[PDB]
Write an enzyme that holds these catalytic residues in place. Structure first.
Site, PDB file in Angstrom:
ATOM      1  N   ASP A 258      18.809  84.750  36.410  1.00 29.31           N
ATOM      2  CA  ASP A 258      19.210  86.062  35.929  1.00 29.31           C
ATOM      3  C   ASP A 258      18.204  87.161  36.211  1.00 29.31           C
ATOM      4  O   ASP A 258      17.218  87.362  35.488  1.00 29.31           O
ATOM      5  CB  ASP A 258      19.528  86.071  34.442  1.00 29.31           C
TER       6      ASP A 258
ATOM      7  N   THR B  73      15.001  92.115  25.734  1.00 28.96           N
ATOM      8  CA  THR B  73      15.371  91.510  24.467  1.00 28.96           C
ATOM      9  C   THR B  73      14.351  91.914  23.420  1.00 28.96           C
ATOM     10  O   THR B  73      13.149  91.849  23.702  1.00 28.96           O
ATOM     11  CB  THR B  73      15.420  89.977  24.612  1.00 28.96           C
TER      12      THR B  73
ATOM     13  N   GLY C  15      19.673  72.182  32.776  1.00 28.64           N
ATOM     14  CA  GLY C  15      20.138  73.055  31.720  1.00 28.64           C
ATOM     15  C   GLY C  15      19.082  74.061  31.291  1.00 28.64           C
ATOM     16  O   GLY C  15      18.099  74.318  31.987  1.00 28.64           O
TER      17      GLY C  15
ATOM     18  N   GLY D  68      28.202  78.560  30.475  1.00 25.95           N
ATOM     19  CA  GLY D  68      27.725  79.492  29.473  1.00 25.95           C
ATOM     20  C   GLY D  68      28.444  80.811  29.638  1.00 25.95           C
ATOM     21  O   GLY D  68      29.326  80.969  30.485  1.00 25.95           O
TER      22      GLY D  68
ATOM     23  N   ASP E 206      12.984  90.560  31.782  1.00 29.78           N
ATOM     24  CA  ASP E 206      13.811  89.827  30.822  1.00 29.78           C
ATOM     25  C   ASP E 206      13.322  88.394  30.673  1.00 29.78           C
ATOM     26  O   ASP E 206      14.118  87.469  30.477  1.00 29.78           O
ATOM     27  CB  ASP E 206      15.290  89.857  31.212  1.00 29.78           C
TER      28      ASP E 206
ATOM     29  N   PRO F 150      20.333  71.302  37.283  1.00 29.21           N
ATOM     30  CA  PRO F 150      21.069  70.302  36.491  1.00 29.21           C
ATOM     31  C   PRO F 150      20.452  69.982  35.146  1.00 29.21           C
ATOM     32  O   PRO F 150      21.113  69.313  34.341  1.00 29.21           O
ATOM     33  CB  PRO F 150      21.069  69.065  37.399  1.00 29.21           C
TER      34      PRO F 150
ATOM     35  N   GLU G  80      15.809  81.842  27.146  1.00 26.52           N
ATOM     36  CA  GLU G  80      17.205  81.851  27.585  1.00 26.52           C
ATOM     37  C   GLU G  80      17.352  81.969  29.091  1.00 26.52           C
ATOM     38  O   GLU G  80      18.396  81.584  29.626  1.00 26.52           O
ATOM     39  CB  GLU G  80      17.977  83.001  26.938  1.00 26.52           C
ATOM     40  N   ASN G  81      16.363  82.527  29.785  1.00 32.90           N
ATOM     41  CA  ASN G  81      16.493  82.814  31.208  1.00 32.90           C
ATOM     42  C   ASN G  81      15.760  81.807  32.076  1.00 32.90           C
ATOM     43  O   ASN G  81      15.629  82.023  33.280  1.00 32.90           O
ATOM     44  CB  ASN G  81      15.993  84.227  31.516  1.00 32.90           C
TER      45      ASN G  81
ATOM     46  N   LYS H 101      12.343  85.273  28.910  1.00 25.72           N
ATOM     47  CA  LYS H 101      12.554  84.629  27.618  1.00 25.72           C
ATOM     48  C   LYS H 101      13.076  83.212  27.886  1.00 25.72           C
ATOM     49  O   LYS H 101      13.521  82.923  29.002  1.00 25.72           O
ATOM     50  CB  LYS H 101      13.549  85.422  26.747  1.00 25.72           C
TER      51      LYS H 101
END
Ligand SMILES: C=CC(=O)Nc1cccc(Nc2nc(Nc3ccccc3)ncc2Cl)c1
Lengths: 20, 334
Positions: free
Chosen positions: B173, B190, B115, B39, B155, B113, B159-160, B157
């Site tokens: 992150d 965000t 994702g 990514g 942060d 692994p 995505e993290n 969310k």
């Protein structure tokens, strides 16, 4: 539908965090 | 209560020793070989790498030092590495090694692994409440851990959040994590996930993470966040308005929990009251949750990944390393 409005928005991909 | 107090006191001892004496320069780039780019981030890329000697696989976050200074993210990056190397919890990605060269900062992280939860959530649309509850419970326990160390995550969310081989969550992150007693002021995070007091320039504390949990649970269970619009400034207006509409399929327990997390009034927001995190853990939406079983990873996961790749593909580019050292002074403690 609310879902359709979301999917049509520009903010369905990975969202950048604002740093400032 | 009696054993949870002693668990957290030992965890804080472990954390403080590494916080006060951070590991530094524990690897070099030539010890690793690229498998694939996983990514991209604000200052660089994340790559899957293998350790040449041991054979172990890791995610390597690469940060371009010049892009970090330019985006005035130096102190956040220093925060990120110092904190992440010092924490230890089942649902946090471990920072296994770090180092820098002339151009870049490198964080060699535990590989998950399965994702990104973000990919899985967008692909399937929304999670059932039991599946959302399973992930939310891990975030609750993680925030209880982090907040006991005077850390704010800032942060949260999809995505993290990453999925590991067992189907459990790992928070990745720490780019905005910060150790603070009392209040802080940086407008960061965000937009969809910002608590109102971040937007209102009031100063804020760890309660902003509990708000973000509300946003996360809502997005997992609905398939879209509670406040969305085409531009961040319209998102901010809905956040401060203090009005949430729930889909008709939300249970009463879920709506009730979310009204208490998405609570504009700090003196009323769950997680920020006298009983602390126990108001969340004892809420009726979590009635089926065995909190110890979740911590021990004894609960059946909603789905197990299958290692061989329905992950996102990125173009492979060289890691450029300048002949001249960049930004040495700014990153000396990294
Ligand atoms: C915009 C990217 C983003 O928000 N997060 C992101 C993206 C890719 C990788 C990572 N970090 C990580 N990713 C994995 N495992 C993994 C990720 C994607 C596909 C398959 C496996 N493991 C550890 C980390 Cl620290 C974070």
């Amino acid at each position: 539908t609310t879902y359709a409005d979301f999917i049509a928005s520009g903010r369905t991909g990975r969202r950048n965090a604002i740093h400032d | 209560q009696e054993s949870v107090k002693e668990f957290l006191a030992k965890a804080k001892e472990d954390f403080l020793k590494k916080w006060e004496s951070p590991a530094q320069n524990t690897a070099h780039l030539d010890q690793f070989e690229r498998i694939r780019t996983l990514g991209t981030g604000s200052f660089g890329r994340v790559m899957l790498v293998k350790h040449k000697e041991t054979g172990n696989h890791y995610a390597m976050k690469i940060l371009d030092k010049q892009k970090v200074v330019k985006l005035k993210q130096i102190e956040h990056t220093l925060n990120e590495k110092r904190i992440q190397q010092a924490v230890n919890f089942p649902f946090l990605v471990k920072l296994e090694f770090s180092f820098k060269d002339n151009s870049n900062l490198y964080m060699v992280l535990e590989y998950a692994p399965g994702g990104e939860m973000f990919s899985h959530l967008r692909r399937i649309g929304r999670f059932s409440e039991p599946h959302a509850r399973f992930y939310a419970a891990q975030i609750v326990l993680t925030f209880e851990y982090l907040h006991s160390l005077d850390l704010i995550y800032r942060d949260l969310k999809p995505e993290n959040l990453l999925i590991d081989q067992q189907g459990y969550i790992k928070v990745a992150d720490f780019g905005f994590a910060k150790r603070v007693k009392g209040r802080t002021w940086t407008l960061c995070g965000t937009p969809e996930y910002l608590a109102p007091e971040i937007i209102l320039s009031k100063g804020y504390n760890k309660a902003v993470d509990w708000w973000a949990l509300g946003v996360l649970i809502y997005e997992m269970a609905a398939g879209y966040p509670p406040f969305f619009a085409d531009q961040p400034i319209q998102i901010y207006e809905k956040i401060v308005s203090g009005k949430v509409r729930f889909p008709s399929h939300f249970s009463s327990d879920l709506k009730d929990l979310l009204r208490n997390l998405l609570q504009v009034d700090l003196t009323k927001r769950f997680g920020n009251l006298k009983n602390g995190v126990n108001d969340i853990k004892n809420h009726k939406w979590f009635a089926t949750t065995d909190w110890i079983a979740i911590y021990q990873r004894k609960v059946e996961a909603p789905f197990i990944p299958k290692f061989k790749s329905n992950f996102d593909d990125y173009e492979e580019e060289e890691i450029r390393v300048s002949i001249n050292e960049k930004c040495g002074k700014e990153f000396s403690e990294f």
